[PDB]
């Protein structure tokens, strides 16, 4: 197949993952623009290939305005191309760094959209496993712009509230206690990560952090976080409450996305 190289012109870099690069591209026949996630595949093992197919398959199964849309999946000689609709506002990560933190209003709006994209995965039997601000993209730079869930590279399927050992994977600061404890897990891990994200939205830094990654994981497994003054003095108890429910160490006790979209701090507006 040369199906990509002669149907698309590649443009500039939009971002980078662990071993992928995402470039803007333009379909030649139409002049329509897309984001091409490019993976060098001569490097890859059989398992990795399967993960790529799984990523494509799961993306397609999801249709939501807050989930990125996969337009094509093309395998060439030394490269695989996943062509997605272009989301032009950059990563949520960049916006938080750019603004330092979101007001309680903006943060509420933002986490509402994230939780909606997550709950959509969950009701469709998918756990993403890698919720973080780098994998959430903004429809544009404008306050309250639409947030889109990206990066289904680690996503897997699980039914309902079932939990099994799906392996050690995710992003360190966002990893849940049950993954770190190597206990069986399920959809609940994404809510933990959303709890981390919401804390980040509110003060601009994460609740779990250490230069020593061993201590980091220990802090996470213990659920050891606080709300340091003065950053958190202005923040309402109602918001802190929601973070606390999302950051509940025992996944069985943990709030679900469905009943998180009910929380007063998100709804009482």
């Amino acid at each position: 197949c040369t199906r990509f190289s002669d149907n698309y012109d590649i443009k500039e870099e939009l971002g980078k993952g662990a071993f992928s690069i995402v470039k803007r591209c333009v379909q030649k026949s139409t002049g329509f623009e897309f984001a091409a996630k490019i993976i060098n595949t001569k490097k890859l093992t059989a398992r990795d290939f399967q993960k790529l197919e799984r990523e494509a398959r799961i993306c397609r199964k999801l249709h939501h305005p807050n989930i990125v849309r996969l337009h094509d999946s093309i395998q060439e000689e030394n490269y695989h191309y996943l062509v997605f609709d272009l989301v032009t506002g950059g990563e949520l990560f960049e916006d938080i760094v750019a603004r330092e933190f979101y007001s309680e209003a903006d943060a509420s709006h933002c986490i509402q959209q994230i939780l909606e994209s997550v709950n959509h995965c969950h009701q469709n039997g998918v756990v993403h496993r890698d919720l973080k601000p780098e994998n959430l993209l903004l429809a544009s730079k404008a306050k309250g712009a639409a947030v889109k869930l990206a990066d289904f590279g680690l996503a897997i399927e699980v039914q309902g509230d079932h939990q099994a050992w799906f392996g050690f994977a995710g992003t360190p600061g966002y990893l849940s206690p049950e993954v770190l404890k190597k206990e069986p897990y399920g959809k609940s891990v994404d809510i933990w990560a959303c709890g981390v994200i919401l804390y980040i939205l509110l003060v601009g830094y994460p609740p779990f952090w250490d230069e020593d990654q061993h201590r980091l994981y220990s802090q996470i497994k213990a659920g050891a976080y606080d709300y340091p003054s003065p950053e958190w003095d202005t923040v309402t108890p109602e918001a802190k409450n929601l973070i606390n429910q999302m950051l509940t160490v025992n996944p069985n006790k943990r709030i679900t996305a469905a009943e998180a979209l009910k929380h007063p701090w998100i709804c009482q507006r």
Binding site: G17, A18, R47, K51, F93, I96, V97, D130, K132, P133, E134, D151, G153, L154, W165, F166, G167, F168, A169, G170, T171, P172, G173, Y174, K182, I200, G204, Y205, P206, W209
Partner: peptide, 15 residues
């Protein structure tokens, strides 16, 4: 503690 990028890991081990 500060907001910095973090790379995704996958050490597998699924059973």
């Amino acid at each position: 503690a500060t907001l910095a990028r973090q790379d995704t890991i996958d050490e597998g081990g699924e059973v």
